[PDB]
PDB file of C-alpha atoms in Angstrom:
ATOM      1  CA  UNK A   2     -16.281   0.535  11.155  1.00 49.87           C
ATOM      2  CA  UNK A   3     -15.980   3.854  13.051  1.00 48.35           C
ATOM      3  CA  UNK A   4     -12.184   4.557  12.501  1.00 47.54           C
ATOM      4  CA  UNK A   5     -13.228   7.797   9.739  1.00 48.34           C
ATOM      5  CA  UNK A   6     -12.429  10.277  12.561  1.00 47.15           C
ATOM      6  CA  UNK A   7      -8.547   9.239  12.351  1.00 50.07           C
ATOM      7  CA  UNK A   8      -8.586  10.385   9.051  1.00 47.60           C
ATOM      8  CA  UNK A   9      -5.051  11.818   7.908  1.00 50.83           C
ATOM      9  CA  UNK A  10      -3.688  13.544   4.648  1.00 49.63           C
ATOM     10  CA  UNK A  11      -1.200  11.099   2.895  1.00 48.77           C
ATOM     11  CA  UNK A  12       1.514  12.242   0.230  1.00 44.80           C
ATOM     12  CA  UNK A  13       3.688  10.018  -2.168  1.00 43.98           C
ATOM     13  CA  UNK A  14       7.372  10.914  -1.592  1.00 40.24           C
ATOM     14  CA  UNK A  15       8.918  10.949  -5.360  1.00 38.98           C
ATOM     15  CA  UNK A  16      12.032   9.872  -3.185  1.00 36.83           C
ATOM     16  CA  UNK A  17      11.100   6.126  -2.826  1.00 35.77           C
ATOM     17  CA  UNK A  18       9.665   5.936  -6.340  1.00 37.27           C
ATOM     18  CA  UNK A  19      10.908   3.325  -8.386  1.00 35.46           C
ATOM     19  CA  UNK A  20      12.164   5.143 -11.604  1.00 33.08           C
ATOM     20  CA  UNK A  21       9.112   4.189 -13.773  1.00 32.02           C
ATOM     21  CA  UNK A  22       6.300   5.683 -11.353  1.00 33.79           C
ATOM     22  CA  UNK A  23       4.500   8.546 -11.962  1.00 33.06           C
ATOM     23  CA  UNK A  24       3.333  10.193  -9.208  1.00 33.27           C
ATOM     24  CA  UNK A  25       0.771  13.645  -9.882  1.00 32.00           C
ATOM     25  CA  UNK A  26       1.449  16.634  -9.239  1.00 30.11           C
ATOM     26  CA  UNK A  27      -0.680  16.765  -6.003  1.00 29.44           C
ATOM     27  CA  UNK A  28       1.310  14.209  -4.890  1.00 29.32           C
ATOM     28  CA  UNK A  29      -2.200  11.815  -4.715  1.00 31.80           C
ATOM     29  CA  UNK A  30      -2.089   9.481  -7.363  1.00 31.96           C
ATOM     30  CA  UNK A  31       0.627   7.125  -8.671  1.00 31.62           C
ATOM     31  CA  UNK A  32       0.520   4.895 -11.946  1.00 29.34           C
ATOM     32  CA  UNK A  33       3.404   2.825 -13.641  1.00 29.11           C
ATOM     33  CA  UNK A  34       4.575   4.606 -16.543  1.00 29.77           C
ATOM     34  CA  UNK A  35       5.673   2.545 -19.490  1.00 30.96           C
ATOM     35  CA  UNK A  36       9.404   3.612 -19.684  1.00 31.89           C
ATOM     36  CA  UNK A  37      12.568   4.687 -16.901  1.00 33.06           C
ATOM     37  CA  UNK A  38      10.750   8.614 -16.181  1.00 32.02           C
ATOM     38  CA  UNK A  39      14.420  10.459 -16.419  1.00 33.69           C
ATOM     39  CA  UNK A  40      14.900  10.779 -12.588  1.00 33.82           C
ATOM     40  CA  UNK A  41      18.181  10.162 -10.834  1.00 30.53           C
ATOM     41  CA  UNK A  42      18.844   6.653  -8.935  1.00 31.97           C
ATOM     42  CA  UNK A  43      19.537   7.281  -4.979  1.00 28.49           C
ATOM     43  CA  UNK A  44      19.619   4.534  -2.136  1.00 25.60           C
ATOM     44  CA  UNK A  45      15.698   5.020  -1.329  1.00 26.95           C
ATOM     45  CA  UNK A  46      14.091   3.693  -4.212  1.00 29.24           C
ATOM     46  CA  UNK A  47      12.695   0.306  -4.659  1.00 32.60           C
ATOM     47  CA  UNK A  48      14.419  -0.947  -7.637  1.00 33.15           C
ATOM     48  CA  UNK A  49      12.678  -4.745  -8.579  1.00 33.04           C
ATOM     49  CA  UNK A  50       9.188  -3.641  -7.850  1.00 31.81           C
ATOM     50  CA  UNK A  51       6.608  -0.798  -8.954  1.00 29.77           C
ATOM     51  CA  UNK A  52       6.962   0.574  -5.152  1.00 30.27           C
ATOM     52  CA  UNK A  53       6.079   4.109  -3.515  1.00 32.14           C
ATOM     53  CA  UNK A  54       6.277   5.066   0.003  1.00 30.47           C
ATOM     54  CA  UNK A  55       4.356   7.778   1.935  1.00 31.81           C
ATOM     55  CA  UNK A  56       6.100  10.804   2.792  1.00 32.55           C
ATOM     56  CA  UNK A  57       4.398  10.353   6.692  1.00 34.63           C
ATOM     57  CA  UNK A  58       5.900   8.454   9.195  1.00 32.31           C
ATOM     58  CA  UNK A  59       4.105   7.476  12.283  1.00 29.35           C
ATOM     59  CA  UNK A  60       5.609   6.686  15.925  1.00 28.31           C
ATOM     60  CA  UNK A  61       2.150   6.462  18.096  1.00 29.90           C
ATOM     61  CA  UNK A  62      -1.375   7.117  17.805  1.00 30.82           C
ATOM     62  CA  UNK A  63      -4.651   5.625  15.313  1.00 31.89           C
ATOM     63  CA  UNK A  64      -4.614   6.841  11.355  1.00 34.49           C
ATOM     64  CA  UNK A  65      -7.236   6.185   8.823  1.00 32.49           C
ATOM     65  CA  UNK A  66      -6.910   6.458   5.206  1.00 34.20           C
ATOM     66  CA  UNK A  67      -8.630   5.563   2.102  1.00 36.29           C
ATOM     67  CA  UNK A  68      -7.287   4.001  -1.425  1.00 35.40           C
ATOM     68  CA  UNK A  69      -8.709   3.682  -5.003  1.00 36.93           C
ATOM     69  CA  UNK A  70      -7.621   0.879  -7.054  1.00 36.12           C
ATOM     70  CA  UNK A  71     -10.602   1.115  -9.279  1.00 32.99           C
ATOM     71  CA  UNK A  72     -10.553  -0.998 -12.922  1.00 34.79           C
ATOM     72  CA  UNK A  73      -6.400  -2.709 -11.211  1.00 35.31           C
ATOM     73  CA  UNK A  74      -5.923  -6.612 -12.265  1.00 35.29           C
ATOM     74  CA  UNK A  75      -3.145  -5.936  -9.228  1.00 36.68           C
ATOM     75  CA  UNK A  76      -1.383  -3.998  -6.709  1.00 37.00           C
ATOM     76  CA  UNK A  77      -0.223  -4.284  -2.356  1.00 39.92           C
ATOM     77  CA  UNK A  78      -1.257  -1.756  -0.128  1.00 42.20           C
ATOM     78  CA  UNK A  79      -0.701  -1.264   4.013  1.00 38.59           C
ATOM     79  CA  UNK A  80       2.314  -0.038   5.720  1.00 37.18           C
ATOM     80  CA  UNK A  81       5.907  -0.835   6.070  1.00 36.78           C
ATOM     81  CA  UNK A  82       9.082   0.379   8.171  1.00 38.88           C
ATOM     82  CA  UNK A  83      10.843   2.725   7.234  1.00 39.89           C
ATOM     83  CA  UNK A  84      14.245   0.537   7.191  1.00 40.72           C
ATOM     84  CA  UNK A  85      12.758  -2.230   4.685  1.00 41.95           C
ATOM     85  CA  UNK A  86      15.142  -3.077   2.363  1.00 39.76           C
ATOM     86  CA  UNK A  87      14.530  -1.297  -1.143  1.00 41.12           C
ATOM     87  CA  UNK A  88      16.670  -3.302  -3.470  1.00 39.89           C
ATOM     88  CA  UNK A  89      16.569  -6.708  -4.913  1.00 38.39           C
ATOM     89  CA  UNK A  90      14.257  -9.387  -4.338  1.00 33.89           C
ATOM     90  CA  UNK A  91      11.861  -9.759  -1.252  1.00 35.42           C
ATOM     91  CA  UNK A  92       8.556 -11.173  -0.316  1.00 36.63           C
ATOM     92  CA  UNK A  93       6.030  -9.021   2.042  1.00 37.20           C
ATOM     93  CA  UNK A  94       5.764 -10.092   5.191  1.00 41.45           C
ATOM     94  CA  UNK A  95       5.605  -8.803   8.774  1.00 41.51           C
ATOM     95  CA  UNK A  96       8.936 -10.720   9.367  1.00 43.19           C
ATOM     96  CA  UNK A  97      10.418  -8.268   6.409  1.00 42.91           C
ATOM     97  CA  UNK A  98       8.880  -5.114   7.705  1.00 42.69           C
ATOM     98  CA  UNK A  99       5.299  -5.060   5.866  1.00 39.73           C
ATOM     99  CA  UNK A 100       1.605  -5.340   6.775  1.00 39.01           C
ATOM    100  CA  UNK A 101       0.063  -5.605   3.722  1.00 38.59           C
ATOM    101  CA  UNK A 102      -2.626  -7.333   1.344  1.00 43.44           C
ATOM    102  CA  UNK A 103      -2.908  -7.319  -2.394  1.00 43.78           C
ATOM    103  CA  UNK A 104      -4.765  -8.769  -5.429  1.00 48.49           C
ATOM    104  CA  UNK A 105      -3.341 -10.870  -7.470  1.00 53.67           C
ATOM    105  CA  UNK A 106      -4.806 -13.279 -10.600  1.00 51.86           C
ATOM    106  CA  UNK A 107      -8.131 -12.738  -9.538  1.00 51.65           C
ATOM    107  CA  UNK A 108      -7.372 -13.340  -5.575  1.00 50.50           C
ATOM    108  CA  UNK A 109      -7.263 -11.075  -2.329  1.00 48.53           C
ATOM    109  CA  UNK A 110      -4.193 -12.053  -0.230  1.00 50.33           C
ATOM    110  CA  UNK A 111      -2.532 -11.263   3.269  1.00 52.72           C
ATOM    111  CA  UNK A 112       1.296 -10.707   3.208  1.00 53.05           C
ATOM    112  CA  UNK A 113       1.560 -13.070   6.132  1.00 52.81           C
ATOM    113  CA  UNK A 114       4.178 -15.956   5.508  1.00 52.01           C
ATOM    114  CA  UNK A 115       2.651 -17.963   4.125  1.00 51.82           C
ATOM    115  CA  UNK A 116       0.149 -15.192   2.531  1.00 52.09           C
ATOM    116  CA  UNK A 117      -3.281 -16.167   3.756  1.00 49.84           C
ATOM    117  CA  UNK A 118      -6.518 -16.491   1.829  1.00 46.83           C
ATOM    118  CA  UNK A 119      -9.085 -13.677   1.784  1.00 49.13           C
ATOM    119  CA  UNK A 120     -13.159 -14.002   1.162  1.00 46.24           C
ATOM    120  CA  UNK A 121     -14.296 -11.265  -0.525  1.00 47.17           C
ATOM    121  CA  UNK A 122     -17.786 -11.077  -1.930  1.00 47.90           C
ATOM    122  CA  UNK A 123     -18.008  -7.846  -3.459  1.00 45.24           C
ATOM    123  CA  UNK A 124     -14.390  -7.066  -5.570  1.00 42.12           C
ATOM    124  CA  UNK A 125     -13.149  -3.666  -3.413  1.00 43.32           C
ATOM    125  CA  UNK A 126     -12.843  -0.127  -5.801  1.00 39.15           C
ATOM    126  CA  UNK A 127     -11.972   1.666  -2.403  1.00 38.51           C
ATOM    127  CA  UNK A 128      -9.753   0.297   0.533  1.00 39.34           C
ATOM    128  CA  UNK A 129      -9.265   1.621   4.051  1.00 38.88           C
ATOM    129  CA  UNK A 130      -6.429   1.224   6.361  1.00 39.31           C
ATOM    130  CA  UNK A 131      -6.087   1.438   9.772  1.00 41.38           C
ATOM    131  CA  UNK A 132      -3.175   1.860  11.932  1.00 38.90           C
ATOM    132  CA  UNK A 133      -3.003   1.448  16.099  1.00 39.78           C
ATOM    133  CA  UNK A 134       0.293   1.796  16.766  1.00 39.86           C
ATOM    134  CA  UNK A 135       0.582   1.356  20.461  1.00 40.63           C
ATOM    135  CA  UNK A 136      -2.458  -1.783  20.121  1.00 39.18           C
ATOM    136  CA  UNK A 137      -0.130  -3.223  17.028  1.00 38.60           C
ATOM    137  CA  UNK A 138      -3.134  -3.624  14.655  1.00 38.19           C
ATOM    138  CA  UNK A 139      -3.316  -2.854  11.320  1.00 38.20           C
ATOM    139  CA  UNK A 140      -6.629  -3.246   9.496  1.00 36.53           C
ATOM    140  CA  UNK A 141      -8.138  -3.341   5.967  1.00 36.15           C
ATOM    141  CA  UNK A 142     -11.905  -2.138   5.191  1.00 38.76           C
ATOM    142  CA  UNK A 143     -14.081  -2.732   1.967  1.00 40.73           C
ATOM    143  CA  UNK A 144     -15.474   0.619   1.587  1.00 43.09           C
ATOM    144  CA  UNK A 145     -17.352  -0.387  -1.653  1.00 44.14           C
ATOM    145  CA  UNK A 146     -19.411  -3.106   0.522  1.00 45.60           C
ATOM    146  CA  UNK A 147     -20.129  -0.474   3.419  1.00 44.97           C
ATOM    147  CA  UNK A 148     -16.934  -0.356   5.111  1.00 43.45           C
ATOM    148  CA  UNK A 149     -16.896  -4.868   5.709  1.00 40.08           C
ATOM    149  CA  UNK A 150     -13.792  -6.134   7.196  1.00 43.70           C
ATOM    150  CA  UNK A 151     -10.976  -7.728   5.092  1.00 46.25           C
ATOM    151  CA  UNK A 152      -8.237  -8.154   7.213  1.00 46.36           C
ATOM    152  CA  UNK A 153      -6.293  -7.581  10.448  1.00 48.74           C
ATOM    153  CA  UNK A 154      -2.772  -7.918  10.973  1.00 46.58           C
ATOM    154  CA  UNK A 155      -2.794  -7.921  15.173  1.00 47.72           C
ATOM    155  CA  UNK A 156       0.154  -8.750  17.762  1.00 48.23           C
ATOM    156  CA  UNK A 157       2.182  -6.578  15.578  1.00 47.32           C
ATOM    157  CA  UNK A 158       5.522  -5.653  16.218  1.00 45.30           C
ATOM    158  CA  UNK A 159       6.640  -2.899  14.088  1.00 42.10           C
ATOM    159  CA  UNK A 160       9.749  -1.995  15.319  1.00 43.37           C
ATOM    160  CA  UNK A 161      10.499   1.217  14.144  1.00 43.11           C
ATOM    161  CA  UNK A 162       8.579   4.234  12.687  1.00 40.55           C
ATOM    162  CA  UNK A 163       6.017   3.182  10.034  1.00 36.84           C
ATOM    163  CA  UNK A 164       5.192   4.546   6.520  1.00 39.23           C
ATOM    164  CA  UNK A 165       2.208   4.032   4.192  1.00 39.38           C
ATOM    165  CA  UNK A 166       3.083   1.323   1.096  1.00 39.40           C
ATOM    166  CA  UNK A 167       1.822   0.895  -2.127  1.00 41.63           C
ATOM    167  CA  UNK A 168       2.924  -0.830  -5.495  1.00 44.71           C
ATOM    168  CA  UNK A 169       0.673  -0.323  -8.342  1.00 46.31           C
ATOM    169  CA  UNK A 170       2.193  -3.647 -10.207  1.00 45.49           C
ATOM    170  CA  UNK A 171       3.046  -4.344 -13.008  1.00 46.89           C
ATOM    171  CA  UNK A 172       1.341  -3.857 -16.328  1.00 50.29           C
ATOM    172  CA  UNK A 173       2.389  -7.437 -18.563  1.00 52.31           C
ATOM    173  CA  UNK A 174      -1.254  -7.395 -19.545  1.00 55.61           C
ATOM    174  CA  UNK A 175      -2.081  -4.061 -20.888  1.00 58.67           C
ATOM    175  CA  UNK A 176      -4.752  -3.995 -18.455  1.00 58.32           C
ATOM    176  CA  UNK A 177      -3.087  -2.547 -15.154  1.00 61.98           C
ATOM    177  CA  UNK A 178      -2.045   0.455 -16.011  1.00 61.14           C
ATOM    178  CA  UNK A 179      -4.822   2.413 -13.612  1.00 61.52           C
ATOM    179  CA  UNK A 180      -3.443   4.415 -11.249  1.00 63.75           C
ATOM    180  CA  UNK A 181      -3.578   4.086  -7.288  1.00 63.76           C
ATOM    181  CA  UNK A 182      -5.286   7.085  -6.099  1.00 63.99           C
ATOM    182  CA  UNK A 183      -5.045   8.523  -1.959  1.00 65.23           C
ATOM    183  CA  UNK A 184      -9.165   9.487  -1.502  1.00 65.41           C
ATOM    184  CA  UNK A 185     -10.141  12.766  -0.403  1.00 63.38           C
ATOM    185  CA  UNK A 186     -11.026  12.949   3.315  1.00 65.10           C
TER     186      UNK A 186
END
């Protein structure tokens, strides 16, 4: 792809954390901690999931950036509204508010509903994203197998201003506990 140029600076916003995130100092990287990390509830945080939201919104225009999820048995990634719901139960789909796609048991999935099978040859350390907001696309790169294809979400209609998503998952098997990590530009 050729979408580098959009390139734009994203920040985790401690806001939307659930309570057991740990989010760096630079406000790059975020890993699931193994206990509640003695922050305050408020009505922004996802409470049943290990979910962060970007502290950018977008209205218009192409962005570009790039996500490590080096040595993770799972985790979602894309973008959401800003109004998806935060507590309780719900899946990931455009329907809810997401465009997203995750691994999971040794599978690559779209958040479409139903979630939709992905082929992937060579297991991702790096993913890109790409947003068109006024095209509705969102897109998904492999940038450890030269920037392939993975996914697009088009004939999206997102409905409000959009934010970047993550969840790190959950770490049942003692081997998830890498963090998510926003690659330098």
């Amino acid at each position: 792809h050729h979408h580098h140029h959009h390139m734009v600076h994203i920040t985790l916003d401690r806001n939307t954390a659930n309570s057991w995130l740990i989010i760096s100092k630079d406000r790059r990287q975020v890993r699931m901690g193994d206990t509640h990390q003695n922050v305050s509830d408020n009505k922004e945080r996802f409470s049943n999931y290990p979910m962060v939201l970007g502290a950018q919104r977008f209205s218009s225009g192409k962005m570009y950036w790039e996500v490590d999820v080096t040595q993770k048995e799972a985790w979602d990634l894309g973008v959401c509204r800003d109004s998806v719901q935060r507590k309780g139960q719900f899946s990931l789909s455009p329907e809810n508010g997401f465009w997203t796609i995750w691994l999971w048991q040794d599978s690559y999935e779209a958040g479409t509903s139903p979630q939709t099978t992905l082929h992937i040859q060579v297991p991702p350390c790096q993913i890109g994203i790409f947003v068109d907001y006024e095209a509705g696309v969102v897109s998904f790169y492999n940038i450890t197998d030269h920037g392939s294809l993975i996914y697009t979400f088009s004939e999206c209609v997102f409905a409000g201003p959009l934010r970047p998503f993550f969840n790190v998952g959950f770490n049942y098997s003692g081997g998830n506990a890498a963090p998510l990590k926003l690659c330098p530009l």
